[PDB]
Amino acid sequence: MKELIYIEEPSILFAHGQKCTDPRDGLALFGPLNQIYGIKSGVVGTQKGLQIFKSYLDKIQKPIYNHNNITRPMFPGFEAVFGCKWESQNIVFKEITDEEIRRYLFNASTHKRTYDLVTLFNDKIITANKNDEERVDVWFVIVPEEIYKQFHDQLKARLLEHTIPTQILRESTLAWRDFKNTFGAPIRDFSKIEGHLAWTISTAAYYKAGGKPWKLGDIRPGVCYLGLVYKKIEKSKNPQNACCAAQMFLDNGDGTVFKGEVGPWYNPEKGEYHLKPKEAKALLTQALESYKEQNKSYPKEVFIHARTRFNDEEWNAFNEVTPKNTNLVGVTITKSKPLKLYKTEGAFPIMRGNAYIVDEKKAFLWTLGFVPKLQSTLSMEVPNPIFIEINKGEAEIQQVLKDILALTKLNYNACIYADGEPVTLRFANKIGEILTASTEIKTPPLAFKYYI
Amino acid sequence: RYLFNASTHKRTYDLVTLFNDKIITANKNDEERVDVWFVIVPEEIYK
Amino acid sequence: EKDKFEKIKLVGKQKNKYWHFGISAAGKLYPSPVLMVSSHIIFTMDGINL
Amino acid sequence: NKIFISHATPEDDDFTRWLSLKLIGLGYEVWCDILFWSTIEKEIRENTCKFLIVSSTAGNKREGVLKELAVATKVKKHLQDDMFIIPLAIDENLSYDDINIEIVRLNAIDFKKSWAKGLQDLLDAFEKQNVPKKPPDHSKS
Amino acid sequence: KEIRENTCKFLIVSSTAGNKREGVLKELAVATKVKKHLQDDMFIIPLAID
Amino acid sequence: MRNKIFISHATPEDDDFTRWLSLKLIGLGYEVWCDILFLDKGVDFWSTIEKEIRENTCKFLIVSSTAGNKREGVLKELAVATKVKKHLQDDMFIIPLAID
Ligand SMILES: [Mg+2]
């Protein structure tokens, strides 16, 4: 028999300096940390899209209940939770006629239809942004049903060109009862989860409008956190491999910084998911200067993690550019290595947080599983564990595992208990997906509002 | 450093570059929203 | 017999189809010599014809 | 120095947890059946300061809330205070003309539109009527 | 129950003891509420005895 | 204690004007009793209104519009105001305000 150690779940810091574990439960009792006075919305869609959006925005002003309020907590309402005013009356509207949509989607092509639709929506948004007096914080693109049947990434990149926050909302999400189809049953019924949809939409809107929902408190001061993800831009001419990063360091005191580190550094080879010495030096220097500009001092340790191994050709450059006594640690997080642990007695899966330590440099973290607080499973069937390996450098495995849970506890795009992998990798992948569809953007913004 | 010496055009370009670099970098590399930016020009910069 | 080996059923019926339980395997030698088995479900139509 | 909240047991529960924890956060000692029969009757008489009753279709006919309301009315007729009972309207399918007696003559607060406005006006009323308090201790909630 | 389901014509006595008593006031409030639902102007017929 | 200046209005609309008037009058140093600002919660609805109209109102201002002049509560307060005016023998006690 082999023993599995347990890692206590991390705690996130909400308003008033109080700690909790579930964001859905900590936002209701205490609330967000910062004060934004209100969200002035903007809609770019058909007039029926405007009606749907206003109906939904009026519906979410009052409490909404789920079927199970232990697994899925209820929603008090936007103003009760966040202390803001996101009303359905201070709404700026830019209409798209059905004639334009039909003209641009009738036959055309595929790469021509998508380009034309993106041009139409972006022309409306950018024109409203540059020549108008009314201030709009978040732009809500209500996409009809015939448009979503590639567009999202193009829209986000071509708006990234001008740094405008945006949120795409299909009409099936907000009016799921009307789009019956089939033989009388909705294609996606939300009847039992209507308190989770409101939670997720509200938290996304709050974050994209300059708000700070929660923050991490249990992480080592001084150390950085970089996550490298490689994407194949090889779909176009001159096949290459682009790399993207994301940094999560802590402020000089009582703060959390979570941005991107982009400028994607390419690789001319085909299967070489690695980096050249000069590009590695540039990446490390940029990250270190980003940390030093905020904390007015150099880091104490750099914690680089990725889904792939690190060769000796890049680590030498990394050590060449690192100054003073800034240590470096390389970690590799594989996801689908075939090890499944069952339970001898019971129909419920293994608890989340169990770690099986193979060697001093390897471990088996369990991120998905059974959460006692929700009394339900975070996944389906038997959960799969992630594999953590200290590739390059010297560090303790337990500290690495604690840091992995801490990173897992930082998803702003959705309001859930936790994820199944560190959020830095996921956000870097999102950034890479956005930047691949673009056309040679120079010095992109480092804020997740424009990407997420 | 920037104000002293240099040409009358060069020093103005340097000060404008400094202020606008700060403003733009804060605009694109930050999360906090700023509706309007206020530039509090010191006394020596004016002359 | 009765589609059950040791009171555990390994083949049944899904509407007009039949479902079978299947496994794979793969060697591994670092921690200890093991045989990692992965589970699958294989569907047929008559019960003998894939 | 207490605050008493009466509600239906199976329904109108989530509102009560939310309100109770919010009021405890700001420093208002509240006595609700969720947090914890003769004890209730002693707290309505010798301990409570403001008696709040939740109005809903599920309520408005339950026996326990009616008995607590009757005891609260008897205490109000002796304490010489006209603001001892403050109904809270937390429904939208019950008219303002179908409210039971003994409370039908009192102006409600209308938590129906939004809960934050109701909480703000409740705190304003407490500050206006000089309900005792302690400095906010958000740890306890 | 009687004021809302069985009555046909409310009558209230008016005196210096009445018009200030709590029970009379509550019955009056319920009667006024029933008055609008029934759409009958002559529902409350006061009786002045003092 | 006849110093208050009672103001009556309609329930759903004709409220912004009443709020503006009450705020301006209180800023000017008068004393104004209104249903919007005053009338603390948990109080009997009509007994306090009657007591204020009888024993506390120096003047009685009623707003007149298509919204009002047909609502039951406005007419009730008007009847009580007329009774108090007849008792007080003050000719200028009800001052209509035609906002519409
Ligand atoms: Mg999103």
PDB file of C-alpha atoms in Angstrom, chain A residues 43-282:
ATOM      1  CA  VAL A  43     -25.049  46.711 -27.794  1.00  0.00           C
ATOM      2  CA  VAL A  44     -24.171  45.959 -31.421  1.00  0.00           C
ATOM      3  CA  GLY A  45     -26.862  43.717 -32.874  1.00  0.00           C
ATOM      4  CA  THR A  46     -30.351  43.476 -34.293  1.00  0.00           C
ATOM      5  CA  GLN A  47     -33.265  45.198 -32.577  1.00  0.00           C
ATOM      6  CA  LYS A  48     -34.558  41.828 -31.369  1.00  0.00           C
ATOM      7  CA  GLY A  49     -31.092  41.305 -29.906  1.00  0.00           C
ATOM      8  CA  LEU A  50     -31.564  44.578 -28.042  1.00  0.00           C
ATOM      9  CA  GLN A  51     -34.940  43.396 -26.734  1.00  0.00           C
ATOM     10  CA  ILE A  52     -33.462  40.059 -25.625  1.00  0.00           C
ATOM     11  CA  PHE A  53     -30.541  41.780 -23.914  1.00  0.00           C
ATOM     12  CA  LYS A  54     -32.754  44.272 -22.082  1.00  0.00           C
ATOM     13  CA  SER A  55     -35.113  41.494 -20.977  1.00  0.00           C
ATOM     14  CA  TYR A  56     -32.202  39.459 -19.599  1.00  0.00           C
ATOM     15  CA  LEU A  57     -30.583  42.479 -17.945  1.00  0.00           C
ATOM     16  CA  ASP A  58     -33.883  43.288 -16.247  1.00  0.00           C
ATOM     17  CA  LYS A  59     -34.332  39.653 -15.201  1.00  0.00           C
ATOM     18  CA  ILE A  60     -30.914  39.429 -13.517  1.00  0.00           C
ATOM     19  CA  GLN A  61     -31.643  42.468 -11.326  1.00  0.00           C
ATOM     20  CA  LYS A  62     -33.633  40.229  -8.937  1.00  0.00           C
ATOM     21  CA  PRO A  63     -32.701  36.939  -7.226  1.00  0.00           C
ATOM     22  CA  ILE A  64     -32.589  33.759  -9.316  1.00  0.00           C
ATOM     23  CA  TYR A  65     -32.646  30.250  -7.841  1.00  0.00           C
ATOM     24  CA  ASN A  66     -31.108  26.958  -8.947  1.00  0.00           C
ATOM     25  CA  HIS A  67     -32.548  23.476  -8.479  1.00  0.00           C
ATOM     26  CA  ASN A  68     -29.838  22.512  -5.958  1.00  0.00           C
ATOM     27  CA  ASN A  69     -28.584  25.437  -3.872  1.00  0.00           C
ATOM     28  CA  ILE A  70     -25.780  23.421  -2.245  1.00  0.00           C
ATOM     29  CA  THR A  71     -24.079  22.331  -5.466  1.00  0.00           C
ATOM     30  CA  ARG A  72     -25.075  25.532  -7.310  1.00  0.00           C
ATOM     31  CA  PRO A  73     -25.580  28.557  -5.030  1.00  0.00           C
ATOM     32  CA  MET A  74     -28.341  31.032  -5.816  1.00  0.00           C
ATOM     33  CA  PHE A  75     -27.795  34.515  -7.254  1.00  0.00           C
ATOM     34  CA  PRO A  76     -28.768  37.454  -4.991  1.00  0.00           C
ATOM     35  CA  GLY A  77     -28.775  39.943  -7.884  1.00  0.00           C
ATOM     36  CA  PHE A  78     -26.187  42.191  -9.485  1.00  0.00           C
ATOM     37  CA  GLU A  79     -26.565  45.236  -7.242  1.00  0.00           C
ATOM     38  CA  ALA A  80     -26.842  43.112  -4.091  1.00  0.00           C
ATOM     39  CA  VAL A  81     -23.641  41.198  -4.877  1.00  0.00           C
ATOM     40  CA  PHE A  82     -21.290  43.680  -6.526  1.00  0.00           C
ATOM     41  CA  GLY A  83     -22.586  47.009  -5.234  1.00  0.00           C
ATOM     42  CA  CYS A  84     -22.638  48.410  -8.776  1.00  0.00           C
ATOM     43  CA  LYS A  85     -25.360  49.612 -11.132  1.00  0.00           C
ATOM     44  CA  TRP A  86     -25.601  47.765 -14.457  1.00  0.00           C
ATOM     45  CA  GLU A  87     -28.998  48.989 -15.624  1.00  0.00           C
ATOM     46  CA  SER A  88     -31.073  48.316 -18.734  1.00  0.00           C
ATOM     47  CA  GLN A  89     -31.731  52.024 -19.374  1.00  0.00           C
ATOM     48  CA  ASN A  90     -28.260  53.602 -19.691  1.00  0.00           C
ATOM     49  CA  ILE A  91     -27.646  51.513 -22.795  1.00  0.00           C
ATOM     50  CA  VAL A  92     -25.985  52.758 -25.993  1.00  0.00           C
ATOM     51  CA  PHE A  93     -27.302  51.005 -29.101  1.00  0.00           C
ATOM     52  CA  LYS A  94     -25.836  50.670 -32.600  1.00  0.00           C
ATOM     53  CA  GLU A  95     -28.195  48.828 -34.928  1.00  0.00           C
ATOM     54  CA  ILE A  96     -27.386  46.285 -37.627  1.00  0.00           C
ATOM     55  CA  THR A  97     -30.201  45.883 -40.135  1.00  0.00           C
ATOM     56  CA  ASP A  98     -31.267  42.435 -41.305  1.00  0.00           C
ATOM     57  CA  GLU A  99     -30.684  43.561 -44.898  1.00  0.00           C
ATOM     58  CA  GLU A 100     -26.966  44.057 -44.240  1.00  0.00           C
ATOM     59  CA  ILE A 101     -26.669  40.641 -42.582  1.00  0.00           C
ATOM     60  CA  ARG A 102     -28.473  38.899 -45.444  1.00  0.00           C
ATOM     61  CA  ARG A 103     -26.359  40.726 -48.032  1.00  0.00           C
ATOM     62  CA  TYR A 104     -23.099  39.813 -46.298  1.00  0.00           C
ATOM     63  CA  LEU A 105     -23.999  36.171 -45.558  1.00  0.00           C
ATOM     64  CA  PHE A 106     -26.075  35.169 -48.606  1.00  0.00           C
ATOM     65  CA  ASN A 107     -23.453  33.252 -50.614  1.00  0.00           C
ATOM     66  CA  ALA A 108     -20.030  35.012 -50.577  1.00  0.00           C
ATOM     67  CA  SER A 109     -17.358  32.571 -49.368  1.00  0.00           C
ATOM     68  CA  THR A 110     -16.173  31.272 -45.987  1.00  0.00           C
ATOM     69  CA  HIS A 111     -13.087  33.416 -45.348  1.00  0.00           C
ATOM     70  CA  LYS A 112     -14.963  36.225 -47.120  1.00  0.00           C
ATOM     71  CA  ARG A 113     -18.184  35.888 -45.108  1.00  0.00           C
ATOM     72  CA  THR A 114     -16.286  35.870 -41.816  1.00  0.00           C
ATOM     73  CA  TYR A 115     -14.146  38.835 -42.873  1.00  0.00           C
ATOM     74  CA  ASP A 116     -17.184  40.827 -44.036  1.00  0.00           C
ATOM     75  CA  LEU A 117     -19.119  40.215 -40.816  1.00  0.00           C
ATOM     76  CA  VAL A 118     -16.084  41.137 -38.713  1.00  0.00           C
ATOM     77  CA  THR A 119     -15.626  44.323 -40.750  1.00  0.00           C
ATOM     78  CA  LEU A 120     -19.272  45.287 -40.243  1.00  0.00           C
ATOM     79  CA  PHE A 121     -19.276  44.767 -36.473  1.00  0.00           C
ATOM     80  CA  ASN A 122     -15.851  46.352 -35.976  1.00  0.00           C
ATOM     81  CA  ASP A 123     -16.755  49.345 -38.135  1.00  0.00           C
ATOM     82  CA  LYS A 124     -19.801  49.959 -35.957  1.00  0.00           C
ATOM     83  CA  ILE A 125     -17.868  49.557 -32.696  1.00  0.00           C
ATOM     84  CA  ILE A 126     -14.809  51.610 -33.680  1.00  0.00           C
ATOM     85  CA  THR A 127     -16.896  54.388 -35.238  1.00  0.00           C
ATOM     86  CA  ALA A 128     -19.023  54.614 -32.098  1.00  0.00           C
ATOM     87  CA  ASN A 129     -15.821  54.693 -30.042  1.00  0.00           C
ATOM     88  CA  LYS A 130     -13.953  57.450 -31.870  1.00  0.00           C
ATOM     89  CA  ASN A 131     -16.700  59.920 -32.887  1.00  0.00           C
ATOM     90  CA  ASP A 132     -19.266  60.003 -30.050  1.00  0.00           C
ATOM     91  CA  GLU A 133     -19.644  61.622 -26.642  1.00  0.00           C
ATOM     92  CA  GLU A 134     -21.343  58.899 -24.592  1.00  0.00           C
ATOM     93  CA  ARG A 135     -18.941  56.666 -22.675  1.00  0.00           C
ATOM     94  CA  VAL A 136     -19.218  52.889 -23.098  1.00  0.00           C
ATOM     95  CA  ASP A 137     -17.190  50.586 -20.852  1.00  0.00           C
ATOM     96  CA  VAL A 138     -18.112  47.132 -22.200  1.00  0.00           C
ATOM     97  CA  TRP A 139     -19.448  46.413 -25.688  1.00  0.00           C
ATOM     98  CA  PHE A 140     -21.952  43.547 -25.881  1.00  0.00           C
ATOM     99  CA  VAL A 141     -22.111  41.924 -29.324  1.00  0.00           C
ATOM    100  CA  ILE A 142     -25.432  40.076 -29.570  1.00  0.00           C
ATOM    101  CA  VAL A 143     -24.818  37.582 -32.379  1.00  0.00           C
ATOM    102  CA  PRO A 144     -27.941  36.246 -34.161  1.00  0.00           C
ATOM    103  CA  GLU A 145     -28.424  32.527 -34.665  1.00  0.00           C
ATOM    104  CA  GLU A 146     -27.525  32.550 -38.376  1.00  0.00           C
ATOM    105  CA  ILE A 147     -24.149  34.268 -37.851  1.00  0.00           C
ATOM    106  CA  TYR A 148     -22.619  31.664 -35.510  1.00  0.00           C
ATOM    107  CA  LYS A 149     -23.113  28.920 -38.127  1.00  0.00           C
ATOM    108  CA  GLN A 150     -13.417  31.733 -36.453  1.00  0.00           C
ATOM    109  CA  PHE A 151     -15.506  34.900 -36.117  1.00  0.00           C
ATOM    110  CA  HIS A 152     -14.803  35.416 -32.408  1.00  0.00           C
ATOM    111  CA  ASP A 153     -11.002  35.363 -32.684  1.00  0.00           C
ATOM    112  CA  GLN A 154     -11.017  37.703 -35.691  1.00  0.00           C
ATOM    113  CA  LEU A 155     -13.335  40.123 -33.891  1.00  0.00           C
ATOM    114  CA  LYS A 156     -11.210  40.120 -30.744  1.00  0.00           C
ATOM    115  CA  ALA A 157      -7.923  40.618 -32.614  1.00  0.00           C
ATOM    116  CA  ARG A 158      -9.165  43.420 -34.853  1.00  0.00           C
ATOM    117  CA  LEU A 159     -10.571  45.150 -31.760  1.00  0.00           C
ATOM    118  CA  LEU A 160      -7.330  44.474 -29.866  1.00  0.00           C
ATOM    119  CA  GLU A 161      -5.924  46.739 -32.563  1.00  0.00           C
ATOM    120  CA  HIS A 162      -7.679  49.615 -30.721  1.00  0.00           C
ATOM    121  CA  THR A 163      -7.948  48.199 -27.144  1.00  0.00           C
ATOM    122  CA  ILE A 164     -11.720  48.043 -26.675  1.00  0.00           C
ATOM    123  CA  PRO A 165     -13.238  45.559 -24.182  1.00  0.00           C
ATOM    124  CA  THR A 166     -15.871  43.331 -25.751  1.00  0.00           C
ATOM    125  CA  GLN A 167     -18.162  40.426 -24.889  1.00  0.00           C
ATOM    126  CA  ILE A 168     -19.880  38.192 -27.445  1.00  0.00           C
ATOM    127  CA  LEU A 169     -23.288  36.873 -26.365  1.00  0.00           C
ATOM    128  CA  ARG A 170     -25.275  34.605 -28.660  1.00  0.00           C
ATOM    129  CA  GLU A 171     -29.052  34.899 -28.563  1.00  0.00           C
ATOM    130  CA  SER A 172     -29.467  31.232 -27.608  1.00  0.00           C
ATOM    131  CA  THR A 173     -27.771  31.863 -24.259  1.00  0.00           C
ATOM    132  CA  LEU A 174     -30.058  34.715 -23.176  1.00  0.00           C
ATOM    133  CA  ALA A 175     -33.319  33.438 -24.731  1.00  0.00           C
ATOM    134  CA  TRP A 176     -32.904  29.671 -24.521  1.00  0.00           C
ATOM    135  CA  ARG A 177     -36.652  29.084 -24.114  1.00  0.00           C
ATOM    136  CA  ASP A 178     -37.617  30.782 -27.387  1.00  0.00           C
ATOM    137  CA  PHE A 179     -35.204  28.820 -29.611  1.00  0.00           C
ATOM    138  CA  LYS A 180     -37.180  25.612 -29.178  1.00  0.00           C
ATOM    139  CA  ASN A 181     -36.245  23.632 -32.310  1.00  0.00           C
ATOM    140  CA  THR A 182     -36.183  19.796 -32.142  1.00  0.00           C
ATOM    141  CA  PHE A 183     -39.784  18.584 -31.535  1.00  0.00           C
ATOM    142  CA  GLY A 184     -40.713  20.998 -28.738  1.00  0.00           C
ATOM    143  CA  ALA A 185     -37.761  20.799 -26.362  1.00  0.00           C
ATOM    144  CA  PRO A 186     -35.013  23.440 -26.112  1.00  0.00           C
ATOM    145  CA  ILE A 187     -31.654  22.576 -27.642  1.00  0.00           C
ATOM    146  CA  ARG A 188     -29.982  23.565 -24.346  1.00  0.00           C
ATOM    147  CA  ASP A 189     -32.300  23.894 -21.357  1.00  0.00           C
ATOM    148  CA  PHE A 190     -30.990  26.091 -18.534  1.00  0.00           C
ATOM    149  CA  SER A 191     -33.968  25.535 -16.228  1.00  0.00           C
ATOM    150  CA  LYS A 192     -31.968  23.900 -13.431  1.00  0.00           C
ATOM    151  CA  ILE A 193     -28.812  26.028 -13.818  1.00  0.00           C
ATOM    152  CA  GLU A 194     -30.298  29.509 -14.260  1.00  0.00           C
ATOM    153  CA  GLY A 195     -28.462  30.731 -11.160  1.00  0.00           C
ATOM    154  CA  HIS A 196     -25.070  29.766 -12.564  1.00  0.00           C
ATOM    155  CA  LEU A 197     -25.512  31.517 -15.914  1.00  0.00           C
ATOM    156  CA  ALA A 198     -26.272  34.791 -14.136  1.00  0.00           C
ATOM    157  CA  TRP A 199     -23.289  34.353 -11.805  1.00  0.00           C
ATOM    158  CA  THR A 200     -20.891  33.723 -14.681  1.00  0.00           C
ATOM    159  CA  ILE A 201     -22.175  36.514 -16.933  1.00  0.00           C
ATOM    160  CA  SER A 202     -22.193  39.032 -14.078  1.00  0.00           C
ATOM    161  CA  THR A 203     -18.660  38.204 -12.944  1.00  0.00           C
ATOM    162  CA  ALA A 204     -17.335  38.368 -16.515  1.00  0.00           C
ATOM    163  CA  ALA A 205     -19.001  41.752 -17.053  1.00  0.00           C
ATOM    164  CA  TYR A 206     -17.659  43.054 -13.736  1.00  0.00           C
ATOM    165  CA  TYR A 207     -14.100  41.979 -14.525  1.00  0.00           C
ATOM    166  CA  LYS A 208     -14.155  43.358 -18.069  1.00  0.00           C
ATOM    167  CA  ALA A 209     -15.329  46.765 -16.768  1.00  0.00           C
ATOM    168  CA  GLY A 210     -12.336  47.412 -14.509  1.00  0.00           C
ATOM    169  CA  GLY A 211     -13.463  45.445 -11.461  1.00  0.00           C
ATOM    170  CA  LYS A 212     -11.500  43.170  -9.134  1.00  0.00           C
ATOM    171  CA  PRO A 213     -13.649  40.223  -7.973  1.00  0.00           C
ATOM    172  CA  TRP A 214     -11.185  38.449  -5.664  1.00  0.00           C
ATOM    173  CA  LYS A 215      -7.469  37.960  -5.093  1.00  0.00           C
ATOM    174  CA  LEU A 216      -4.980  35.356  -3.908  1.00  0.00           C
ATOM    175  CA  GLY A 217      -3.379  35.566  -0.488  1.00  0.00           C
ATOM    176  CA  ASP A 218      -1.415  32.351   0.132  1.00  0.00           C
ATOM    177  CA  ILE A 219       1.529  32.564  -2.263  1.00  0.00           C
ATOM    178  CA  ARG A 220       5.224  33.035  -1.591  1.00  0.00           C
ATOM    179  CA  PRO A 221       6.260  36.711  -1.694  1.00  0.00           C
ATOM    180  CA  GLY A 222       8.962  37.528  -4.207  1.00  0.00           C
ATOM    181  CA  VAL A 223       8.634  34.595  -6.591  1.00  0.00           C
ATOM    182  CA  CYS A 224       7.210  35.018 -10.095  1.00  0.00           C
ATOM    183  CA  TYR A 225       5.007  32.643 -12.088  1.00  0.00           C
ATOM    184  CA  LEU A 226       5.439  32.343 -15.864  1.00  0.00           C
ATOM    185  CA  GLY A 227       3.435  30.000 -18.065  1.00  0.00           C
ATOM    186  CA  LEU A 228       4.650  29.219 -21.586  1.00  0.00           C
ATOM    187  CA  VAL A 229       2.338  27.754 -24.237  1.00  0.00           C
ATOM    188  CA  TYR A 230       3.319  27.043 -27.849  1.00  0.00           C
ATOM    189  CA  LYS A 231       0.810  27.450 -30.681  1.00  0.00           C
ATOM    190  CA  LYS A 232       1.191  26.333 -34.297  1.00  0.00           C
ATOM    191  CA  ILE A 233       0.965  29.410 -36.522  1.00  0.00           C
ATOM    192  CA  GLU A 234       2.030  26.962 -39.266  1.00  0.00           C
ATOM    193  CA  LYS A 235      -1.495  27.125 -40.734  1.00  0.00           C
ATOM    194  CA  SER A 236      -0.219  29.992 -42.911  1.00  0.00           C
ATOM    195  CA  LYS A 237       2.912  30.349 -45.038  1.00  0.00           C
ATOM    196  CA  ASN A 238       6.350  29.959 -43.437  1.00  0.00           C
ATOM    197  CA  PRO A 239       5.362  27.356 -40.811  1.00  0.00           C
ATOM    198  CA  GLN A 240       6.443  28.363 -37.317  1.00  0.00           C
ATOM    199  CA  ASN A 241       5.675  27.898 -33.618  1.00  0.00           C
ATOM    200  CA  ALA A 242       4.650  30.914 -31.544  1.00  0.00           C
ATOM    201  CA  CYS A 243       5.172  31.110 -27.786  1.00  0.00           C
ATOM    202  CA  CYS A 244       3.069  33.103 -25.321  1.00  0.00           C
ATOM    203  CA  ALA A 245       3.426  33.764 -21.602  1.00  0.00           C
ATOM    204  CA  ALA A 246       1.525  35.048 -18.578  1.00  0.00           C
ATOM    205  CA  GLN A 247       2.876  36.414 -15.291  1.00  0.00           C
ATOM    206  CA  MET A 248       1.343  36.141 -11.807  1.00  0.00           C
ATOM    207  CA  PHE A 249       3.484  37.966  -9.244  1.00  0.00           C
ATOM    208  CA  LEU A 250       2.504  39.724  -6.023  1.00  0.00           C
ATOM    209  CA  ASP A 251       2.569  43.465  -5.434  1.00  0.00           C
ATOM    210  CA  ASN A 252       4.915  45.196  -3.007  1.00  0.00           C
ATOM    211  CA  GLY A 253       2.229  44.651  -0.376  1.00  0.00           C
ATOM    212  CA  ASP A 254      -1.356  43.371  -0.226  1.00  0.00           C
ATOM    213  CA  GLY A 255      -1.913  42.958  -3.945  1.00  0.00           C
ATOM    214  CA  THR A 256      -1.993  40.557  -6.866  1.00  0.00           C
ATOM    215  CA  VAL A 257      -0.845  41.170 -10.445  1.00  0.00           C
ATOM    216  CA  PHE A 258      -2.136  38.900 -13.225  1.00  0.00           C
ATOM    217  CA  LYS A 259      -1.277  40.054 -16.748  1.00  0.00           C
ATOM    218  CA  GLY A 260       0.152  38.675 -19.981  1.00  0.00           C
ATOM    219  CA  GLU A 261       3.735  38.610 -21.293  1.00  0.00           C
ATOM    220  CA  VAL A 262       3.367  38.611 -25.072  1.00  0.00           C
ATOM    221  CA  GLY A 263       5.174  39.656 -28.199  1.00  0.00           C
ATOM    222  CA  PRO A 264       5.140  36.067 -29.387  1.00  0.00           C
ATOM    223  CA  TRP A 265       8.625  34.679 -29.960  1.00  0.00           C
ATOM    224  CA  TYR A 266       8.535  32.363 -32.964  1.00  0.00           C
ATOM    225  CA  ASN A 267      10.457  29.215 -33.898  1.00  0.00           C
ATOM    226  CA  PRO A 268      11.274  28.476 -37.562  1.00  0.00           C
ATOM    227  CA  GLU A 269      11.295  24.675 -37.166  1.00  0.00           C
ATOM    228  CA  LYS A 270       8.313  22.307 -37.514  1.00  0.00           C
ATOM    229  CA  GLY A 271       8.159  20.081 -34.426  1.00  0.00           C
ATOM    230  CA  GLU A 272      10.588  22.061 -32.238  1.00  0.00           C
ATOM    231  CA  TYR A 273       8.349  23.151 -29.362  1.00  0.00           C
ATOM    232  CA  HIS A 274      11.336  24.984 -27.904  1.00  0.00           C
ATOM    233  CA  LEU A 275      12.913  28.433 -27.933  1.00  0.00           C
ATOM    234  CA  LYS A 276      16.071  30.005 -29.310  1.00  0.00           C
ATOM    235  CA  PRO A 277      18.684  31.563 -26.995  1.00  0.00           C
ATOM    236  CA  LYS A 278      17.998  35.160 -28.057  1.00  0.00           C
ATOM    237  CA  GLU A 279      14.224  34.792 -27.738  1.00  0.00           C
ATOM    238  CA  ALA A 280      14.591  33.167 -24.316  1.00  0.00           C
ATOM    239  CA  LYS A 281      16.852  36.005 -23.168  1.00  0.00           C
ATOM    240  CA  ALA A 282      14.347  38.586 -24.409  1.00  0.00           C
TER     241      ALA A 282
END
